[PDB]
Design goal:
This is part of a larger assembly, with eleven protein chains of eleven kinds. Chain A is mostly helical. Chain A has 22 helices and two strands. Classes of the chains: A mainly alpha (469), B mainly alpha (171), C mainly alpha (86), D mainly alpha (108), E mainly alpha (60), F mainly alpha (64), G mainly alpha (183), H mainly alpha (168), I mainly alpha (86), J mainly alpha (89), K mainly alpha (76). The structure holds cardiolipin (2 copies), Phosphatidylinositol (2 copies), 1-palmitoyl-2-linoleoyl-SN-glycero-3-phosphocholine and 1,2-Distearoyl-sn-glycerophosphoethanolamine. Chain E: It comes from Yarrowia lipolytica.
Chain lengths: 469, 171, 86, 108, 60, 64, 183, 168, 86, 89, 76
């Protein structure tokens, strides 16, 4: 029911004016809510990890894919509930964060492109769907055309995504050259012994992986994330990561991979030591994206990674989403506003935030402790369940470097708190206008998931046991 | 099952059928006669052709080497039909495929010598054209009157022979 | 009334294409030995025309007819070799 | 040596001859643009290229009876809504400032 | 269409026996090549023993 | 028990409404019917997750 | 008659030559002119291998639309460009001389299935053997290539044509998403 | 002849605790066998989208003042509410064919109608205007397309032989 | 998908060995696939003709050294306008 | 596979080692897709199937829409600036 | 001047408006909607009343499903 939305709304947005864009996005938000509420009984289809192949060996519908398929709609409701809703009703807050006319179209075209990878079986559905979502990132980036950094960022992302798309197509063509089939189950565990496939299957992996930020090629993505406006980048940092990582994790084509193990170590090294001396907040935040997307090639090395992956992905998506929404709240209290597209740029700028309000720093403190794995929080059990699989299957140096990477990373997570609880000299005594109700209720709910998800941890393990085994 | 190359180089082999496959009486008919006599060798040699394709089916991959016995017998009976149609109706058979050698060998262009040949063979050789798979209340196309698709030039000798067959009353 | 000087160019163009196409049909019938051309050629029909060239002996589409084959017809059958296509 | 290939070898010779007789006989010796001009060619390509997605159906129209029909109909009906997007948004029309905005004369 | 399928098994049998004859001729020619130095001319490069026409010949 | 599993999720809902008031710099009881809204919504989530866990346990019971 | 033999290796040499003239040219239009030369050398190879249909599809869309598109862009835009000077591009030579060797040899490695790493490479060149073409009389109607593409895009892979609709949709929405400036 | 399956297919392979009728239901059958509690879900979804928009602007208004949204958006809300209601309707009613929900009053009706057209001598499912290869391909497309209701709508309109039933 | 569809819509040149291997894997419990291996080796050699290439290399290696060359019924090459000349 | 690998490798190094203009990047990217096609289509011929040709006729389309998208991205980049630089974006 | 009344402010009056003032979008959308709407309503009327569908063509050699009863004849 994405395309039932897209085909309808594209005719609806073609005729509506520029003032109607907010209420269009509000409509699409409520539509996605009711698709999640009235249609989420399709979990009953699987009961014992039952998998369906639909459209004729072309799509693959199982329950891992159903969970990612539900996760993406949930985070899209949280993202679309930002563009729909005003932050404050002021002159500044109308000229900041303006949604373009075609933006709401490109989100749902990207979700179509992201869902048709996690659900994908054939290589041609893989290739058409990485193309659909890569175009949508080319155009979600460039839709704020009257920005110098955003246009330079879209033009860089174009050529780098183009090289990695031709590398993937070369690997797909090459696997076709050595075996007649395109589907991954033509492997069926007898090929791989009697066939040198390691080089093909890694080059297929590394083609997607380098699109996401695998760390010899991490420098271009950090530049694109720092250059886009602060609301394009929460979406274009969440979506391609989780979509292809659940692809590469559903179809375990690189087990024991030495190239993947090296680049996993190199990711955990250079992310945690790259974020150390950095003064821009989206930078710091994107290398926190990099180390956490490098607790991913680890599970990609494993076999049977569907508790560790799924728990850590919904952990990371809530935590990610919440801390971007915290600094989007934090821009009202700062003293200096530059650069209309990207209003807070430096982490020096959110000083003394506890003297402005204390509960936004309470929220910020629980999310930044959830990134560094503090045990009564939901972000802890993600690293715990990665480590119950890394050590389960023989990766011992990987475990030590995982630990050292977590410790070096916490040093620049805690810089956010070191800045935000300090004396400011100019405290707020009375704000005349208050922040939007629903858009702060969303962050309060995303906190209370993080701080109280260990309550339901045990239910999730039993549910999981039934529905994936 | 494959279309030829950039630079394909033709070759033959001056050799012999080695020891145990006997000599056979192969069809020396060109495209026009066996396209003309196709329904009649399909009507007489139905179970032999059926038997050969069945034997080729059951020996999967054995195939070529397996049913030498039996593609021997479809050739013999097809040669039998075309010798019989020679000695039966050489003149009207010849009329039909001298028609059908023009018109791209389109069957559409030669109804007139066709119906004459079909009378001749149904009389002497008592074999009949059928288009199978054709459910009733559907007229077979080589029986209908005033078709939409008419040829460019009706050839002359079949005009004359069909008119004389009208005058004699054999048609 | 009608102008003749206006219609003589189109008369020449018409007559040029007319005499061209007439010459073309005669050249095609002379090459094939008195029969019209095959305009749409199947893979089946191409294999069949090659077999006819093999059967009749040398000439293109002579379309001979015989009760059996000659003894040379059994031995003249060809296979086509083909380069590596690197 | 068939009769197709002398023609497409022989024509570049005819062009080279008509060119060499010209070299023999002759005498010898950024501005800003509108978005519509760039957009006609940029947008021409996704409408030229559905045509070649339409080219394999038109050859095999008999085989895919009653089913490839509906697939092609749905393909075209998904393309028509992007067409009606661009014609609802007045995409190709180029505008100018010739109107005096027709504001009534207000006094005092 | 029905005319072509009536003509199919006849030409099929013809190409069948040409396949058998020219194949066994290539096998015997390669046998007379490989006399002396010990090497199997008769063992096929398949494992399921069937009759494949050869391919990939030596450039004439 | 079903009842404590409702009351705890309703308490999570009261915490959501409370913390959402406190980010907006409102008092604790600002719109005191909104506590009823959030309590009923999160309690309904507890209903859903409770019933999914029930049915999953019964599916495990039927495998013997 | 064996003048007509080396036709494939000829076009391979011409493609090498033509890309050397892509990446070493003065004007930005001279490079796309050798690029349409490269498309037509490719289309000659595609006819040569046995695919007459594709060669003309490559002429229709690759010296068709996207050619005209690039020629068009280079016309109505100014683009500064330097020349291939030795003082700015000889520093890249010892990396190119490594990456040529490594990328070519490794791109010729994966067509093989042994595990020696020298018998893998030597199966790419050790193929001078002529495939034998038999006539099978099993096919009755001229289902050529384009018929089978129209049967597989429309029945077996109808979803790929139907997602493809969304991709061409996006290729229409995108340039209007950008280049309009509504109101 | 146009009703022979000639592929191999699982027989009575139930997807839940209840016995399946049907592996893909034809669209007319799904609209036939749906309960009144299902038309309920359609009505609740047509009611929940315009009331949902008016509620969600009662929370925070668009222009700072609480005004009702225009009738223009209420019409589109009613349309997409029928869209969600029909998606949930087809989705529920075809879970009942798979034997994954409670399957009591439809197994009897599918005894009844299949037995009532075995008596009239015609095909148990119906004669399509397709060759049997197109029936196989067109029902490999429409097999289990109700998963992926979150992405795309796809339905059965093909009327092919096999449905995972006992004999044919 | 388009599993074994040919250029002309039929079957590939290696469809039989693949269908034999899928018969093998259909009746075989997982981790009992070692008995399934010879059908697979037949299929990979159908695709790439590797063992046939090595065998013809060894036959040509013994052939090419000898001064006698060829004492066998030879393989005669013809030009394309002379398929059925004699 | 020689002509495809050569177009791919040499087009790739023509992409990597430019510093002079922006359009050589676009046209080297386009000839890489050509180089992938030249390998795929011959594997379709030599294996006797259309399914490599299926991926070919799909990637023709994706190369097309890729060019349409990316040249609209360039006109975005040029509208706001004055002249596309020599050294790059 | 002729302005837009709206499709929602009276449908049939709007179609009457668009037939006069925009015939390049009425008689273009009305000739293309008369195809897939007539394909759902005019086809069973034909299959019952004008003529039923045709028999399908053969595609390959039609193999039967028998077990080779032994043929007699054409031995030598
Ligand atoms: C059969 C009978 C003959 C056919 C019917 C003949 C009439 C055909 C409709 C005419 C088109 C409507 C129209 O206004 O004219 C042109 C219309 C121009 O409108 P306008 O007056 O210029 O707008 C200017 C206003 O200022 C702007 O005013 P506005 O802001 O109010 O917007 C106007 C409106 C204009 O658009 C419309 O009013 C058309 C809306 C109609 C939608 C439904 C039509 C299809 C009906 C199917 C019937 C099925 C039963 C068939 C059973 C047959 C059994 C044998 O646009 C929209 O509001 C957005 C479209 C919303 C579409 C919702 C579609 C999804 C729900 C419906 C399908 C549900 C299926 C669920 C199944 C899936 C489950 C997973 O042109 C278009 O914009 C394109 C139309 C796209 C149609 C989609
Ligand atoms: C809400 C409901 C959805 C609309 C329903 C309208 C159809 C209807 O009620 O007819 C009943 C009618 C009942 O007749 P029956 O006598 O009871 O039995 C049928 C015979 O067995 C049929 O005879 P057969 O068994 O021998 O099979 C042959 C059949 C074989 O037909 C097939 O097999 C076609 C299979 C394709 C299914 C298509 C599913 C749609 C995919 C949506 C796009 C997915 C995007 C994914 C991208 C990623 O051939 C046909 O009959 C084709 C008729 C072609 C007429 C084209 C009409 C175009 C309408 C387009 C409307 C689109 C916009 C609507 C929304 C606004 O069914 C038909 O006659 C065939 C209808 C096929 C038309 C498919 C139209 C799909 C459009 C819906 C998609 C959007 C909404 C979701
Ligand atoms: C974009 C533009 C597109 C460009 C196209 C042109 C070229 C494209 C090719 C490059 C594509 C991209 C390359 C990506 C990196 C290649 C990935 C790669 O190394 O796999 C290698 C293949 O081992 C060679 O045999 C590797 C040997 C390769 C031959 C070396 C090269 C020869 C140079 C001569 C000087 C192995 O991986 P892997 O860790 O899974 O392999 C391990 C490991 O081998 C075993 O010890 C383990 O026991 C086993 O578990 C296994 O998993
Ligand atoms: C998605 C929601 C969740 C995201 C994170 C997920 C958590 C898991 C599930 C959570 C379940 C969520 C259930 C919805 C909860 C319903 C609910 O409490 O009433 C709402 C929140 O309403 C959403 O904010 C609605 C939330 C967003 C939906 C937008 C469209 C409605 C409470 O606002 P509120 O009383 O302070 O708002 C007040 C009050 O309405 C009046 O005093 C004024 O008119 C107004 O200006 C403001 O001061
Ligand atoms: C009335 C609604 C009002 C509007 C609300 C809108 C959106 C609400 C969205 C999300 C709320 C949280 C629901 C979580 C469902 C998890 C299902 C599941 O644990 O998944 C398991 C497998 O997971 C996994 O592998 C691991 C996931 C690990 C999750 C880590 C964070 C969890 C901690 C907090 C989450 C629970 C908080 C409960 C709050 C009362 C599969 O089981 P399933 O797919 O059958 O469950 C869905 C059935 N369903 C659709 C009917 C609900
Ligand atoms: C017989 C009954 C059915 C006839 C229905 C006719 C509706 C006529 C549509 C219409 O009113 O078009 C005019 C209108 C123009 O809008 P306007 O106010 O002038 O301002 C923007 C101008 N660019 O609206 C428009 O903007 C034009 C948008 C529609 C353009 C349609 C042309 C695309 C080709 C359509 C192919 C047919 C599709 C039919 C659907 C098939 C599936 C059912």
């Amino acid at each position: 029911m994405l395309i039932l939305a897209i085909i309808s709304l594209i005719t609806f947005v073609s005729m509506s004016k520029l003032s109607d864009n907010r209420a269009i996005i509000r409509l699409i938000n409520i539509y996605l809510i009711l698709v999640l509420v009235l249609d989420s009984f399709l979990y009953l289809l699987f009961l014992n990890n039952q998998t369906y192949t639909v459209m004729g060996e072309l799509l693959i519908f199982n329950s891992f894919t159903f969970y990612i398929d539900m996760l993406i709609y949930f985070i899209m409701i949280v993202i679309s509930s930002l563009y729909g809703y005003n932050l404050y009703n002021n002159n500044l807050y109308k000229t900041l964060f303006e949604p373009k006319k075609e933006l709401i179209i490109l989100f749902l075209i990207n979700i179509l492109g992201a869902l048709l990878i996690v659900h994908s079986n054939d290589f041609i559905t893989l290739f058409v769907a990485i193309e659909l979502q890569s175009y949508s990132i080319y155009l979600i980036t460039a839709i704020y055309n009257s920005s110098y950094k955003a246009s330079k960022a879209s033009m860089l992302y174009f050529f780098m995504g183009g090289i990695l798309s031709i590398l993937i197509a070369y690997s797909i063509n090459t696997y076709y050259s050595v075996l007649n089939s395109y589907t991954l189950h033509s492997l069926d565990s007898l090929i791989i012994n009697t066939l040198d496939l390691n080089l093909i299957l890694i080059a297929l992996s590394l083609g997607l992986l380098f699109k996401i930020g695998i760390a010899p090629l991490h420098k271009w993505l950090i530049s694109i994330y720092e250059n886009t406006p602060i609301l394009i980048t929460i979406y274009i940092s969440l979506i391609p990561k989780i979509s292809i990582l659940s692809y590469l994790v559903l179809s375990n084509i690189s087990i024991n991979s030495l190239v993947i193990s090296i680049l996993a170590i190199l990711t955990l090294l250079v992310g945690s030591v790259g974020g150390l001396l950095q003064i821009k907040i989206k930078r710091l935040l994107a290398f926190s994206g990099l180390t956490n997307a490098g607790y991913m090639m680890l599970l990609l090395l494993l076999n049977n990674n569907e508790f560790s992956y799924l728990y850590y992905i919904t952990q990371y998506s809530i935590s990610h989403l919440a801390i971007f929404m915290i600094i989007i709240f934090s821009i009202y209290y700062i003293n200096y506003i530059n650069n209309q597209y990207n209003p807070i740029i430096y982490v020096n700028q959110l000083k003394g935030l506890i003297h402005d309000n204390a509960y936004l720093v309470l929220s910020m403190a629980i999310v930044v402790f959830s990134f560094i794995g503090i045990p009564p929080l939901l972000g802890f059990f993600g690293k715990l369940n990665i480590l119950m699989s890394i050590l389960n299957n023989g990766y011992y140096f990987i475990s030590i470097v995982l630990i050292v990477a977590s410790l070096i990373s916490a040093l620049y997570y805690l810089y956010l708190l070191n800045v935000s609880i300090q004396d400011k000299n100019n405290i707020l005594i009375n704000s005349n206008e208050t922040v939007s109700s629903v858009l702060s209720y969303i962050l309060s709910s995303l906190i209370i998931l993080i701080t109280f998800g260990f309550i339901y941890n045990s239910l999730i393990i039993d549910i999981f046991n039934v529905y994936f085994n | 099952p494959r279309e030829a190359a950039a630079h394909w180089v033709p070759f033959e082999d001056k050799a012999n059928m080695p020891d145990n496959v006997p000599d056979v009486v192969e069809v020396g008919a060109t495209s026009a006669p066996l396209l003309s006599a196709s329904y009649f060798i399909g009507a007489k040699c139905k179970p032999y052709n059926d038997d050969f394709m069945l034997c080729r089916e059951e020996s999967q991959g054995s195939g070529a080497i397996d049913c030498l016995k039996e593609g021997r017998r479809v050739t013999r009976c097809a040669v039998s039909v075309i010798e019989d149609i020679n000695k039966s109706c050489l003149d009207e058979f010849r009329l039909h495929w001298q028609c059908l050698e023009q018109n791209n060998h389109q069957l559409s262009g030669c109804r007139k010598a066709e119906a004459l040949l079909n009378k001749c063979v149904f009389t002497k050789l008592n074999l009949e054209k059928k288009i199978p798979g054709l459910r009733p209340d559907e007229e077979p196309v080589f029986l209908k009157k005033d078709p939409w698709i008419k040829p460019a030039v009706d050839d002359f000798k079949s005009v004359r022979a069909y008119a004389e067959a009208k005058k004699n009353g054999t048609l | 009334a009608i102008p003749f000087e206006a219609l003589l160019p189109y008369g020449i163009i018409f007559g040029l294409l007319t005499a061209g196409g007439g010459a073309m049909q005669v050249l095609h019938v002379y090459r094939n030995g008195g029969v019209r051309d095959r305009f749409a050629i199947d893979q089946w029909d191409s294999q069949m025309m090659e077999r006819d060239l093999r059967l009749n002996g040398g000439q293109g589409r002579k379309q001979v007819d015989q009760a059996t084959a000659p003894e040379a017809f059994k031995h003249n059958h060809v296979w086509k070799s083909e380069r590596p296509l690197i | 040596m068939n009769t197709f290939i002398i023609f497409i070898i022989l024509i570049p010779i005819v062009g080279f001859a008509l060119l060499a007789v010209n070299i023999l006989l002759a005498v010898y010796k950024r501005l800003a643009f509108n978005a519509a001009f760039i957009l006609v060619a940029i947008l021409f390509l996704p409408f030229d290229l559905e045509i070649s997605t339409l080219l394999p159906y038109v050859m095999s129209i008999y085989l895919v009876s009653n089913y490839g029909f509906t697939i092609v109909l749905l393909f075209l009906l998904i393309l028509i809504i992007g067409f009606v997007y661009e014609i609802n948004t007045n995409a190709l029309k180029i505008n100018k400032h010739n109107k005096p905005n027709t504001d009534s004369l207000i006094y005092k | 269409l029905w005319a072509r399928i009536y003509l199919m098994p006849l030409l099929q049998a013809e190409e069948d026996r040409q396949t058998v004859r020219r194949s066994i001729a290539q096998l015997e020619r390669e046998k007379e090549i490989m006399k002396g130095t010990g090497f199997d001319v008769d063992k096929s490069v398949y494992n399921d023993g069937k009759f494949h026409a050869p391919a990939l010949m030596i450039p004439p | 028990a079903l009842f404590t599993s409702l009351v705890g999720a309703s308490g999570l809902g009261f915490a959501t409404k409370f913390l959402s008031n406190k980010i907006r710099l409102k008092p604790a009881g600002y719109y005191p019917l909104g506590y009823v809204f959030s309590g009923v919504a999160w309690a309904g989530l507890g209903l859903v997750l409770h019933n999914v866990h029930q049915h999953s346990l019964e599916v495990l019971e039927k495998k013997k | 008659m064996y003048l007509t033999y080396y036709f494939i290796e000829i076009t391979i040499f011409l493609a090498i030559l033509c890309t050397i003239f892509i990446i070493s040219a003065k004007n930005p239009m001279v490079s796309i002119l050798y690029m349409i030369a490269l498309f037509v050398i490719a289309a000659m190879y595609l006819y040569l291998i046995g695919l007459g249909i594709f060669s003309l599809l490559y002429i229709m869309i690759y010296i068709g639309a996207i050619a005209v598109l690039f020629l068009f862009i280079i016309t109505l835009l100014d683009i500064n460009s330097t020349e291939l000077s030795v003082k700015s591009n000889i520093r890249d030579l010892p990396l190119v001389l490594i990456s040529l060797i490594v990328l070519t040899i490794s791109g010729l490695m994966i067509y093989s299935n042994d595990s020696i790493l020298i018998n893998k490479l030597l199966e790419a060149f050790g193929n001078d053997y002529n495939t034998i073409i038999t006539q099978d009389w099993f096919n009755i109607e001229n289902t050529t290539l384009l018929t089978t593409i129209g049967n597989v895009l429309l029945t077996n892979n109808a979803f790929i044509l139907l997602v493809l609709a969304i991709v061409l949709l996006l290729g229409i929405i995108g340039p209007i998403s950008i280049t309009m400036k509504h109101k | 002849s146009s009703s022979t399956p000639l592929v191999k297919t699982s027989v009575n392979y139930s997807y839940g605790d209840y016995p399946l009728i049907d592996a893909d239901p034809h669209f007319k059958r799904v609209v036939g066998y749906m309960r009144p509690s299902d038309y309920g879900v359609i009505g609740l979804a047509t009611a929940a989208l315009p009331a949902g928009i008016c509620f969600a602007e009662w929370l925070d208004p668009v222009k700072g003042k609480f005004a009702r949204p225009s009738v223009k958006f209420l019409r589109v809300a009613t349309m997409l509410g029928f869209a969600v209601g029909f998606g949930a309707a087809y989705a529920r009613s075809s879970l009942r064919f798979f034997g994954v929900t409670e399957n009591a009053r439809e197994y009897k009706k599918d005894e009844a109608q299949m037995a009532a057209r075995k008596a009239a001598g015609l095909e148990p499912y119906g004669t399509s205007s397709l060759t049997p290869e197109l029936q196989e391909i067109a029902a490999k497309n429409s097999a289990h397309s109700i998963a992926g209701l979150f992405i795309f709508p796809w339905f059965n309109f093909v009327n092919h032989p096999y449905h995972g039933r006992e004999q044919k | 998908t388009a599993a074994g569809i040919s250029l002309t819509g039929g079957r590939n040149r290696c469809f039989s060995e693949w269908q034999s291997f899928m018969h093998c894997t259909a009746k075989t419990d997982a981790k009992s696939r070692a008995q399934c291996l010879p059908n697979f080796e037949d299929y990979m050699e159908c695709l790439h003709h590797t063992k046939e290439k090595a065998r013809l290399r060894e036959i040509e290696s013994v052939l090419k050294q000898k001064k006698e060359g060829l004492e066998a019924p030879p393989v005669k090459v013809i030009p394309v306008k002379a398929i059925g000349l004699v | 596979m020689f002509i495809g690998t050569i177009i791919l490798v040499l087009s790739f190094l023509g992409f990597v080692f430019n510093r002079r203009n922006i359009i050589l990047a676009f046209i080297c990217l386009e000839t890489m897709l050509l180089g992938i096609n030249l390998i795929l289509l011959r594997n379709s011929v030599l294996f006797d199937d259309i399914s490599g040709s299926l991926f070919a006729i799909v990637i023709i389309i994706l190369a097309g829409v890729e060019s349409a998208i990316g040249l609209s991205l360039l006109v975005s980049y040029y509208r706001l600036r004055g002249v596309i630089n020599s050294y790059g974006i | 001047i002729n302005a837009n009344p709206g499709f929602w402010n009276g449908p049939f009056r709007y179609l009457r408006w668009s037939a006069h003032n925009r015939p390049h979008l009425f008689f273009a959308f009305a000739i293309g909607i008369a195809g897939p709407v007539a394909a759902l309503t005019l086809t069973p009327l034909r299959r019952k009343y004008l003529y039923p569908d045709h028999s399908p063509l053969p595609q390959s050699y039609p193999l039967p499903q028998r077990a080779r009863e032994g043929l007699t004849g054409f031995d030598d």
